[PDB]
Amino acid sequence: LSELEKQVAGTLLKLEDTLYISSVKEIAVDGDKKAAVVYVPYPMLQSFQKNSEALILKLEKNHSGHRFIIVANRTIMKNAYVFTGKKSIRRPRSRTMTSVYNCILDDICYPIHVIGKRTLYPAGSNPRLQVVLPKAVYNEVSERTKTYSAVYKALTERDTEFIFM
RNA sequence: CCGCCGCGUGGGACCGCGCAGCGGGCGCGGCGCGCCGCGGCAGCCCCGAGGAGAGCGGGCGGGGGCACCGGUACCGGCCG
């Protein structure tokens, strides 16, 4: 129940000539441009991912003022086992904190595959992570690395920086 | 203050175990044993160790066992 969903859904209906989204979150960057995330339901992520690049481009052209990102919504449980007193319940490994963050990272920029991750530990600076991307693509995603870092920090408290190799 | 391998509280990093879905209504204050929509859940597999094992292809080798088999030489005998 927000204004943005209404016009983005209007655009959605204006694309084809079935699939619905859960919610939307926008976050600003250092520049006046913001980035909007779409919390897609988990099962329909792959169906949205067949040609997500086209959808994001058409949405950007339809409604400017901020970039459109599409991601799934995953839950996190905070206990490996559960002691009901009678039987012990195992938490599946897919619901851990670490798996969700990595999947989020891969989803933020699915069309361009990540070729490596590295975390650096400076002497005093808060430890930070730098990823590695192909040189085949750069100017395609060079202009939108700051937004990627900002959204990663927003969703995950962990920070990051982007490079190419 | 000092003879405790036992008792209680907390911490919970390190050290090792946790196979058998959950949520709600019938359902009594609670806990059980059952009946009900799956109609509430992202329902239900870390990765795959310059650890180990199995598999395919390649050649490599006085590696092993069985049968068969040639060559002079030592020895003995015989013709001259």
Residue A118 bridge partners (DSSP):
A130
- Relative to beta strand A81-83, strand A88-90 is antiparallel
The strand B neighbours among A residues 101-160, by Cβ under 7 Å, are: none
Dist CA A68 CA A56 (whole Å)? 6
- Cα four-point dihedral sign A79, A104, A161, A67: negative
3 state DSSP class of A31:
coil
CA A79 to C1' B32, in angstroms, rounded, equals: 26
Q: Which nucleotide is nearest to A91 (CA to C1')?
A: B44
From the CA of A66 to the C1' of B24: give the distance in Å: 42
Torsion of CA A158, A20, A6, A72, to 10 degrees: 0
Asked whether residue A86, judged by its CB, lies under 7 Å from any atom of the DNA or RNA strand B, the reply is: yes
Beta carbons of A78 and A91 less than 8 angstroms apart: no
Q: Is A157 helix (H, G, I), strand (E, B) or coil?
A: coil
Extract the tokens encoding A133: 């991307």
Strands of chain A, DSSP E: 23-28, 34-40, 66-72, 81-83, 88-90, 116-120, 128-133, 160-164
H and E: helices and strands count for chain A: 6, 8
Q: Beta-carbon neighbour count of residue A141 at 10 Å? A: 16
List beta partners, residue A82: A89
Question: Any residues with CB less than 8 A from the CB of A60 and at least 6 apart, and which?
Answer: A67, A68
- Resolution (angstroms) equals 3.1
Q: Is the dihedral of CA A22, A62, A141, A48 positive or negative?
A: positive
Q: How was this structure determined?
A: cryo-EM
Q: How far is CA A25 from CA A34, A81, A104, A119, in A?
A: 10, 32, 15, 27
